[PDB]
RNA sequence: GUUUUU
RNA sequence: GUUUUU
RNA sequence: GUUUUU
RNA sequence: GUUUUU
RNA sequence: GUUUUU
């Protein structure tokens, strides 16, 4: 029998930094001690929230449209600013620009939050232009996008990813930008997404009882392949 | 019919007009908790009659076994009960060497001697009963050194004998439960005496059961140097005891006619 | 069906024996049990399984400290005052606030003061200075049950510190119990 | 030897220890009990008031806002747990003679705060007709916005016991009787978080 | 022992019998051996004591009688005398 | 339950703690001889209604054949 | 230390914004001598149940 | 049942130099904690 | 499922003299750490 | 509630 | 990715 | 190399 | 030597 | 004594 050896408590070596507290790995925090009377769990009630289940993934929120650099008043510079709230006019000639600006994720309310949370990301971005005109107004508008561009200057969109918008019943037009960068993941708050330009293709037509100019709204969201990766410090403070 | 019938009609009528939601009324009739009954409880020789009883109460999940499972008292549970039948010292006397044959050494009133003093185990109960029926187990002890000799007659004398004692011939007393015990040979005598009387029961605190006596069969022959103070002791145990008639505390009651 | 007794009509003089889980109803009402947590917080083992402050002692020297241990009329432990008798394991939480030294701790239900002079026989677990230990004292009680109220309902606690230099400090104490056996619930306490 | 002892319930007259405390919270206790009956026609918290031949129908014999702390047994849990849930049961016991007769309606507006006499037609009420069993119960099912509710927070509601039919009597019977109000938790009662103390017992 | 520290109206937690006069004339209480010690010294009050309080004072009409008597009867469901001792001599079974 | 239930509890509790000698108490509950009943008797064109009847009596081992 | 406080909330849900959205934290120190110091606090949650997403926040 | 012994957390002896950091053995470094999410 | 209890890291009691180094028992020394690559 | 992990 | 170790 | 221990 | 514990 | 937990 093992009576040739005196019985003893197990001896173990304690690794470096015992007592060190890891506030980075979730696998570490979830295992923390419980101040609960019996280290028990509670029964959650989604109904009171009107939901059938909790919200598990945040990416889905990044996939929700939000106005770009939204303002109370339309672009007072013929749309050459970041305001995603500009006017299209009977006055503007074809090839004239109704909007132009360099796009960044922070220009979007929902996205700007992730920009201040995660350090990198990847995936396609979707922009939806909604022109609110009357049933009589007609015309076309081509909006292109040069991925990764930086020179904020009007330029032919023949080689850019563009979408021609013909006014009808569904006056909301989408444009997808697939992920385009040297790196596999890209800074959330780094290099611009590219040059966004919406040029006039065919003058907005009208009649005696219809407006000679209409309002437009530009929204932005992440694609179904969107992803965010490293959480980083904050660059701004919300309220 | 009525007034008992109402829970059903209301419960039913409510039931008949019920729609999708259900009935809008429920009625139930029954007897009150306080019904017209009579309760009777009997304890030892007692009977309590109550015509206005109430639901008996008791602690939470109670245990009435009343037995200490740890036995903090390591005694037979029936110790207190049998205690009065316990063996006790009924008498002690010093035989005097000069005494002649047939002399009475010592005697004990039977059965009232078992309640001789308030320090007798049986004294307690004996007080609360006027009638007694019991058996005895005596153990007369007499110790004497080997050098000395002698003999004593330990005999039980029922009331009949005690009454007419002088009319009886000594030397014939051997007809009664006795123990001619020859000193220097035996130091103790044993006598088992059952209930003996001309009446089914004997009055408590009476000598009617007769009395045990110790006589001088042959005087003590104590040599010169030998000791001369021999003591005779009478011990008694109750083979079986029975107290029946209830009575006030130690009050003379006549069970006889 | 439902009897008038279960509808509110009863008699207070017909409640014995103690402990009648009688159901009470009305047309739109039924006893509904809803649990918010995976377990009960009313069970004696759970509730009392959580400590509560007891007292503090400041020591400037090794002199021994003996204090009667009793149930609280102050914290959630007060729920014990609803009972009359107790018996079971006793968890004692001691904090040694000192710079350099050791604290001898021991527990005994024995009322005799002298038995505690030689502390080692009793127990005397050692809490190094700046450390806190939780010792579970067994029911080494010479009495089968502990009246829950007594100024010494719980056994006495002993604290002697083996200091090294002029160092001094204070010893805070907390108490809790492991699996408690309470019996014969008595009337609710009054307030001060 | 880090051993366990053999407990002895018998010495306590019990067959088993007490495992759950909720059962104690389910034991009746007089509300704001006093030595003397309500000297304000029952408009106080005293659960010890008098019903009179003098009081008219619809007149109030008792009215007050009910809190768990108003009950000895419950007040203990109030000073121990932070929240709870479940129904509350109040039992009114009117002690009259076998000759006295009459009715009394006691209602309860859950979660009410305005201590003022008000028609109980819409409140949870119970009509009490004097007979042999002169103890009347009234249940209040749990009523709060939250799933659990503060043990020592918002009132349980307005408790009012109005006269329905004047207490009748005769030459050899009392013209007014004594009443007692007890309170306990329902079979669905529960307590949840233990919190600090708000009072000190003795 | 601690009677004054307890809240009346809560005494209903102890084996009791709120008995409403004019309804019940007798109350029944079965009480087992209850103490913090296996045995109680004979000729002692350690087993506790039975009491009778005034739940609600007597409402005696004008003509009705005014002398109500309260009587307490007792029976021993089970009895057990163990330790022997001299006649009625105070003996300490406790420590 | 109650006040009918008492003969059983007392009779039982007495029963549970019983030792070698036996129980030291017996309790029995029931209805009084004078119950709340009504008796009706009808003779030729007559009807006697009594709400407080008593046990009818008669001589020893009587013969009513007449 | 890292203590995980359960949802002993008297409210089924915690509006996420409230100045007390999360329950109150208590810190009392049993000091021994004139010693003093500072207590830094960090927060994290174990398995969180969020519902009804609202519009994105503004910047200061 | 093992109810004759009060239940307890396991007790273990800590070897010399607890907290010492071994920067020589790879088997030691590869097992270090991760700051990964 | 054991989801009625929050998941936790094992808790253990450390015996007396943690960090004490036993230079008497071979069974102790042979188990010492290795500075080997 | 795979709501630690597979 | 046996990319801790077999 | 059972050269940690069986 | 179940002489840690079952 | 499932009286750590299932």
UniProtKB/Swiss-Prot annotation, chain C:
It comes from the Viruses. It is found in: Virion; Host cytoplasm. Signal peptide: none annotated. Interacts with capsid protein VP0, and capsid protein VP3 to form heterotrimeric protomers. Five protomers subsequently associate to form pentamers which serve as building blocks for the capsid. Forms an icosahedral capsid of pseudo T=3 symmetry together with capsid proteins VP0 and VP3. The capsid is 300 Angstroms in diameter, composed of 60 copies of each capsid protein and enclosing the viral positive strand RNA genome. Capsid proteins interact with host alpha-V/beta-3 integrin heterodimer to provide virion attachment target cell. This attachment induces virion internalization predominantly through clathrin-mediated endocytosis. Binds packaging signals present in the viral RNA. This is Capsid protein VP1. It comes from Human parechovirus 1 (strain Harris).
């Amino acid at each position: 029998m093992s009576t040739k050896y005196k019985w003893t408590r197990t001896k173990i070596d304690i690794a470096e930094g015992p007592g060190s507290m890891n506030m980075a790995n979730v696998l570490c925090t979830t295992g923390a001690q419980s101040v609960a009377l019996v280290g028990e769990r509670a029964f959650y009630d989604p109904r009171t929230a009107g939901s059938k289940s909790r919200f598990d993934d945040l990416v889905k929120i990044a996939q929700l449209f939000s106005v770009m650099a939204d303002s109370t008043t339309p672009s007072e510079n013929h749309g050459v600013d970041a305001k995603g709230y500009f006017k299209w006019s009977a006055t503007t000639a074809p090839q004239s620009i109704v909007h132009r600006n360099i796009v960044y994720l922070r220009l979007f309310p929902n996205l700007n939050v992730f920009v201040n949370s995660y350090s990198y990301f990847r995936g396609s971005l979707v922009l939806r232009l909604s022109v609110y005109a009357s049933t009589f107004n007609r015309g076309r508008l081509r909006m292109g996008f040069f991925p990764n561009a930086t020179t904020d200057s009007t330029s032919t969109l023949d080689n850019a990813i563009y979408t021609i918008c013909d006014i009808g019943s569904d006056n909301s037009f989408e444009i997808t930008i697939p992920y385009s960068f040297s790196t596999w993941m890209r800074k959330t708050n780094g290099h611009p997404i590219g040059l966004f330009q919406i040029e006039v293709l065919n003058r907005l037509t009208y009649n005696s009882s219809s407006p000679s100019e209409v309002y437009c709204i530009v929204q932005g969201k992440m694609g179904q392949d969107a992803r965010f990766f490293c959480p980083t410090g904050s660059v701004v403070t919300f309220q | 019919v009525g007034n008992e019938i109402g829970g059903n009609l209301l419960t039913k009528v409510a039931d008949d007009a019920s729609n999708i939601l259900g009935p809008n009324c429920f009625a139930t009739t029954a007897e009150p908790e306080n019904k017209n009954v009579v309760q009777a409880t009997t304890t030892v020789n007692t009977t309590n009659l109550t015509q206005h009883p109430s639901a008996p109460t008791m602690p939470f999940s109670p245990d009435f076994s009343n037995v200490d499972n740890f036995h903090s008292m390591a005694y037979d549970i029936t110790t207190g009960d049998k205690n009065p039948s316990k063996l006790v010292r009924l008498e002690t006397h010093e035989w005097t060497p000069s005494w002649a044959r047939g002399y009475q050494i010592t005697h004990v009133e039977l059965p009232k001697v078992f309640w001789d003093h308030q320090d007798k185990p049986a004294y307690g109960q004996s007080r609360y009963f006027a009638a007694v029926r019991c058996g005895f187990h005596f153990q007369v002890q007499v110790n004497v050194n080997q050098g000395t000799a002698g003999s004593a007659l330990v005999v039980y004398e029922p009331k009949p004998v005690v009454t007419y004692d002088s009319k009886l011939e000594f030397g014939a007393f051997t007809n009664l439960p006795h123990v001619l015990m020859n000193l220097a040979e035996t130091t103790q005598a044993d006598l088992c005496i059952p209930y003996v009387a001309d009446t089914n029961y004997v009055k408590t605190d009476s000598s009617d059961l007769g009395q045990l006596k110790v006589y001088v069969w042959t005087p003590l022959s104590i040599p010169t140097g030998s000791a001369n103070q021999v003591d005779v002791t009478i011990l008694g145990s109750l083979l079986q005891l029975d107290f029946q008639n209830p009575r006030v505390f130690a009050q003379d009651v006549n069970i006889y006619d | 069906t439902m009897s008038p007794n279960e509808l509110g009509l009863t008699s207070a003089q017909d409640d014995g024996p103690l402990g009648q889980e009688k159901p009470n109803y009305f047309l739109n009402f039924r006893s509904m049990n809803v649990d918010i947590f995976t377990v009960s917080h009313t069970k004696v083992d759970n509730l009392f399984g959580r400590a509560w402050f007891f007292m503090e002692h400041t020591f400037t020297n090794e002199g021994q400290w003996r204090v009667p241990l009793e149930f609280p009329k102050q914290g959630h432990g007060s729920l014990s005052l609803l009972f009359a008798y107790f018996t079971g394991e006793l968890n004692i939480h001691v904090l040694f606030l000192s710079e350099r030294g050791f604290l001898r701790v021991a527990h005994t239900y024995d009322t005799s003061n002298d038995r505690v002079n030689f502390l080692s026989s009793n127990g005397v677990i050692t809490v190094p200075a700046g450390e806190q230990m939780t010792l579970s004292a067994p029911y080494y009680s010479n009495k089968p049950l502990r009246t829950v109220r007594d100024n010494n309902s719980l056994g006495y606690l002993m604290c002697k510190p083996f200091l090294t230099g002029t160092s001094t400090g204070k010893i805070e104490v907390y108490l809790s119990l492991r699996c408690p056996n309470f019996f014969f619930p008595l009337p609710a306490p009054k307030v001060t």
